[PDB]
């Protein structure tokens, strides 16, 4: 029969009947390229730290979404607050610079 045992950096000991126990340790030889492109970096760290990599990527995406939404919300609110004073005043100078900084 064929039996597969998971070995980590902590090590694993197996004893085959009447033989002295043998100890083996797994090295950090996971597949990937930590110096390559983002997909190769993610592959390397996923193979080395599956759960940690999943949590990290999900946290980064959540942070990016929350930050981009907040940034866009603040910028759009800024545009509304900056331009509203002039919408209620059709006969206004409306300097060209206003259309460049607040838009």
């Amino acid at each position: 029969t064929t039996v597969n045992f998971t070995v980590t950096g902590e090590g694993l000991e197996y004893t085959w009947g009447n033989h002295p126990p043998k100890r083996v340790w797994a090295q950090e030889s996971g597949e990937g390229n930590p110096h390559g492109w983002p997909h190769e970096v993610v592959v390397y760290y996923y193979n080395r730290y599956p759960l940690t990599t999943i949590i990290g990527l999900c946290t980064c995406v959540a942070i990016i979404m929350v930050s981009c939404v907040t940034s866009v919300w603040l910028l759009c609110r800024t545009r509304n607050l900056c331009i509203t004073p002039y919408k209620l005043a059709p006969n206004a100078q409306v300097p060209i610079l206003l259309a460049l900084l607040c838009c």
């Binding site: 000991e13 083996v24 340790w25 090295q27 950090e28 983002p38 981009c68 800024t78 607050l81």
Partner: protein
């Protein structure tokens, strides 16, 4: 000079440090544990073994009747079977056809095997912790002695006085109750003496293998002898010790965490890699040489020529140097980034030397101390080729050890851009708020 530090509770992995006595050149110190033994205190509760059923000759009373009496024998059984007409080789034993009684007797004894084939039930309490420590320092060869890991009892090892602190973890693989059979130890909540059930582990219990008071709890029941036959038939629950020996399960030797190795003389758990061990060693004053009497090393430049973050000493580095008074000079890396294989090197007036190291960092950056001087080594390390190895890791892996320079760059870009987005939005909001204020005023 007393050197105090904390070393990990690892066996076969040497602890290296430099004893720096003000005014004297550093003395290299290396402390390695040969074995660590947790020796608990045990009290023998009772001994269990396979029972033997002793059956004395039945009393065949012809033309009459007899009565059974109680006796101080374990699980003693006595019953009078009336109406027997036994036959022997010489014919009918009794004259009367039915007025005859056979009194059968039986009791339980320890079998002959009980002297050798028996299980000892022990109560286990916190005991003591001992270790065999291998120490070398300076030019003194390796010396070792048995020491007590309690932080109090000092040990004299090669003129050096060693005090090994208590283990930071009080963990022990033995429960309050263990069963020792042969060379194997089992964590088994054995029944209290006098409570063992028939056909179970404790069916037969004896305070010691040579005691004269035996507890036996088996359904020993005398059956009626077959018609015309002089014999003492009986039924009994099969030995619960034999049953146990079938269903023992996995011994503690095969399930103890942290790789503990269980020994019986005395009962102990060896090489348990739990916690860390504080240490204090008083190095003899004669082992130190004044600073002005040792070589001065300068112009150090460290180049990593090859590196792989394997568990072995996969790293190789070359250090160029200039010095004077050519002679031996210790080498040490105080940080955990890299473990140096060599303990000392021979330095000429000028040249270079090489050393090997083991590191878990993909971009190791560690300080190397060359006696009175130090240099910073930096480089890149390749992944190891072997998936599985038969030796423990020499280095220690840190949280940031695996993060490459590229990963750091991406993290920096992520955080910087995200923060800049929020910062820019807030600045724009503040600017427009001020403009509106100036509009009103």
């Amino acid at each position: 000079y007393e050197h105090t530090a904390v070393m990990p509770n690892k066996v076969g992995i040497p602890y290296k440090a430099l004893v720096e006595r003000p005014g004297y050149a550093p003395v290299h110190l290396q402390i390695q544990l040969v074995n660590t033994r947790i020796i608990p205190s045990t009290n023998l509760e009772y001994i269990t073994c396979k029972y033997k059923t002793k059956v004395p000759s039945p009393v065949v009373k012809c033309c009459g009747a007899t009565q059974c009496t109680s006796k101080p024998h374990p699980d003693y059984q006595c019953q009078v079977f009336s109406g027997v007409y036994p036959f022997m080789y010489g014919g009918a034993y009794c004259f009367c056809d039915t007025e005859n009684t056979q009194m059968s007797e039986a009791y339980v004894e320890r079998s002959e095997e009980c002297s050798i084939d028996h299980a000892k039930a022990y109560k286990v309490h916190t005991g003591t912790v001992q270790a065999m420590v291998n120490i070398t320092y300076g030019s003194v060869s390796w010396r070792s002695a048995d020491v007590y890991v309690n932080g109090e009892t000092p040990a004299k090892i090669g003129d050096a006085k060693l005090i090994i602190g208590p283990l930071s973890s009080a963990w022990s693989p033995f429960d309050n109750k263990v069963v020792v059979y042969g060379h194997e130890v089992y964590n088994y909540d054995f029944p209290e003496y006098g409570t063992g059930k028939a056909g179970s582990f404790g069916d037969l219990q004896s305070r010691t293998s040579t005691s004269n008071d035996l507890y036996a709890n088996t359904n020993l029941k005398l059956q009626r002898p077959q018609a015309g036959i002089v014999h003492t038939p009986f039924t009994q629950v099969p030995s619960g010790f034999e049953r146990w020996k079938k269903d023992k399960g996995a011994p503690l030797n095969d399930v103890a965490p942290f790789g503990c190795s269980i020994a019986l003389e005395p009962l102990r758990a060896e090489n348990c890699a739990v916690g860390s061990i504080p240490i204090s060693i008083d190095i003899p004053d004669a082992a130190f040489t004044r600073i002005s009497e040792t070589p001065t090393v300068s112009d150090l430049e460290c180049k990593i020529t090859e590196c792989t973050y394997a568990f072995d000493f996969g790293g190789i580095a070359t250090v160029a140097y200039k010095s004077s008074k050519a002679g031996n000079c210790p080498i040490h890396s105080p940080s955990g980034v890299a473990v140096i294989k060599e303990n000392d090197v021979t330095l000429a007036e000028s040249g270079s030397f090489t050393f090997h190291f083991s590191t878990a960092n993909i971009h190791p950056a560690f300080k190397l101390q060359v006696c009175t001087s130090a240099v910073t080594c930096k480089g890149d390390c390749k992944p190891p080729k072997d998936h599985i190895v038969d030796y423990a890791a020499q280095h220690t892996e840190s949280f940031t050890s695996a993060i490459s320079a590229t990963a750091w760059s991406w993290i920096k870009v992520l955080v910087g851009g995200t923060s800049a987005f929020i910062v820019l939005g807030l600045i724009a909001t503040a600017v427009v708020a001020l403009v509106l204020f100036f509009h009103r005023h």
